[PDB]
Amino acid sequence: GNVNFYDVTSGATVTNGAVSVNADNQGQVNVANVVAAINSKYFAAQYADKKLNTRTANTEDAIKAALKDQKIDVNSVGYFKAPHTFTVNVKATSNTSATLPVVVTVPNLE
Amino acid sequence: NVNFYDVTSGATVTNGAVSVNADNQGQVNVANVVAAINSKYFAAQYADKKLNTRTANTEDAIKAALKDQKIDVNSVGYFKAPHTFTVNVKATSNTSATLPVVVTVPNLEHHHHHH
Ligand SMILES: NC(=O)c1cccnc1
């Protein structure tokens, strides 16, 4: 009945997530690359009747909101100066909500 | 890669357990054990955000468990219930998994809070 988050590859339910994203040599990251990393690794679904019904997460919005809470601006094409780490609260809602806290690490900052 | 899952929650299960009541004569029917197990647990192969259900051999597993306990089942599926026994339910892969299920018959327990 509830939306849960799941590991894309195993299908196991998850409560906490983590991904790594490499910055470019100038320490910049694009939001679209964070979105792709998170959404490739984790998905949301409502389970019923031996079936998973996928639900869209607000990954992009969640990333920008996490960055703004760390006082990091993103430009109109999605670039920002990355911190070493930030936590994204990825949300998916039900039809009839779940939040996955995903720690993003940017490991290659000078 | 085949796993067993709880029918209602969808959570993966390693070891299952069910309770099945005997009749007044202390007999249980295989069909009631089948229904108890299969109503609660199912097998599936997970891939690509999708569950692909697989058939379990529940009835055969029950009869094999009962045979190994030297418990005879009659032609209409009735047997004299032992207190608790384990059934090894199997499902096969298309690309293969066993769920041990503990079956207990509660009307035949030696200890009980009731008076
Ligand atoms: N941990 C990760 O950065 C990650 C991202 C996507 C898939 N698998 C792992």
Author numbering:
A (entry chain A): 200 to 295, 299 to 312
B (entry chain B): 201 to 295, 299 to 318
Report text from the authors:
S-layer proteins (SLPs) are self-assembling, crystalline proteins coating the cell surfaces of many prokaryotes. We determined the atomic resolution structures of all functional domains (I-III from N- to C-termini) present in the three S-layer proteins SlpA_ac, SlpX_ac, and SlpA_amy. The Lactobacillus S-layers are anchored to the cell wall through interaction with teichoic acids (TA), either lipoteichoic acid (LTA) or wall teichoic acid (WTA).
The SlpA protein (~46 kDa) is the main structural component of Lactobacillus acidophilus ATCC 4356 S-layer, built of two domains. The N-terminal part, exhibiting the first two domains (SlpA_I and SlpA_II), is known to be responsible for the self-assembly of the S-layer protein into a regular lattice. One basic tile is composed of the homodimer of the full-length SlpA, dimerized at the SlpA_II domain. The assembly is propagated in one direction by alternating SlpA_I dimers and SlpA_II dimers and in the other by the pore spanning N terminus of SlpA_I. The self-assembly region (SA) is formed by domains SlpA_I and SlpA_II, building a 2D crystalline network that forms the exposed surface of the SlpA layer.
